Amino acid sequence: AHVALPVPLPRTFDYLLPEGMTVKAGCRVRVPFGKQQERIGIVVSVSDASELPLNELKAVVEVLDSEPVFTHSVWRLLLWAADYYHHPIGDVLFHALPILLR
Amino acid sequence: MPVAHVALPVPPRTFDYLLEGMTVKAGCRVRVPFGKQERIGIVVSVDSELPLNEKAVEVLDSEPVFTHSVWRLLLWAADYYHHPIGDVLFHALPILL
Amino acid sequence: MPVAHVALPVPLPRTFDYLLPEGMTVKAGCRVRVPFGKQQERIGIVVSVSDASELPLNELKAVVEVLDSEPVFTHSVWRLLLWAADYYHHPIGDVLFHALPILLR
Amino acid sequence: PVAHVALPVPLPRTFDYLLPEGMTVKAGCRVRVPFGQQERIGIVVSVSDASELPLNELKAVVEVLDSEPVFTHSVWRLLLWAADYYHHPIGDVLFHALPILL
DSSP, X not given: OEXXXXXXXXXXXXXXXXXXOOOOTTOEEEXXXXXXXXXXXXXXXXXXXXXSOGGGSOBOOXXXXXXXXXXXHHHHHHHHHHHHTTOOHHHHHHHHHXXXXX | OOEEEEEOSOOOOOEEOOOOOOOOOTTOEEEEOOTTOXXXXXXXXXXXXXXXXXXXXXXXXXXXXXXXXXXXXXXXXXXXXXXXXXXXXXXXXHHHO | OOEEEEEOOOOSSOOEEEEOOTTOOOOTTOEEEEEOSSSOEEEEEEEEEESOOSSOTTTSOBXXXXXXXXXXXXXXXXXXXXHHHHHTTOOHHHHHHXXXXXXXX | OEXXXXXXXXXXOOEEXXXXXXXXXXXXXXXXXXXXXXXXXXXXXXXXSOOSSOTTSSOBOOXXXXXXOSSOHHHHHHHHHHHHXXXXXXXXXXXXXXXXXX
């Protein structure tokens, strides 16, 4: 039985960063998704903790951006809007990317 | 730092829990275990990503707390306006009642 | 009083062998999810891969998934850790998993 | 093509053997058990009533070489402590300890 739960604002996925790999908010990263696939996502933030223990977080595979694909302003607005209007931050981020750059 | 909090291209991403002799249907609130930490949730659907072996509590409603109409509507709006089903459902309940 | 839990004098790194699925790849230093005992799984770190299992190549189950594309540890740190485990007589698994949290920032 | 995986296994990594009907041993006693073909001498750390593998799926003991515990009641408590406290493989501590103790 699939159940819905009162989750925290941006429902994000936590990935472990192998030793010696570094990323900053606003950067795209290639990460695993479901048993064996890969997918592109954007780092919303990086902290020192996750609901699950570090040894359980799959590691990021590659960082696609050296610097933020989004502007410091645009980024702040994007995250704002996603939160204010109750929109999935991933949703907002990837949808806005094509608009902003194209 | 260690953990990277990542945004992903929008998946209704729900949590699956095990139900012998306990029955529930869509639109019903249920108490279920949450992390290495009980909590209320709403049954979105009822044969799993991970092993039916490795979190399972009870059904708080015999009948759906939402109308067939209401539910259809709420699920639509969640989808149409890009809002997490959970958010819509839990926030709608109070106004509803 | 049926089961007897016996300690044996085993070699340097007492490690557990698993079979690699068809089309799955992992190298040393990588964490993998594997079956343990009857009910469920657990996370472990690949210490090495080779064509040398001291058991029937069918009596051993297979990896479930690899959580790391690349080594979660550095080439040196890794050299260091395995040494430490051996030199100071500490369980390799103990060293690796305790070291991970401290190591990862 | 096999991976040699290291797992964070609980405190005393021990090996479980079935005690043939009518065979009896006490902690601190050596026993001959099957291993891999060959046999080997091990020291009984304890006797429970269940293991992490199906109750009858595990090889039986072959012979008990000590009817009396080869270690003192105290030395025993000490070594088991030391193994745990200093994170040393119990079988390592016991077998290395034996030659010096004797």
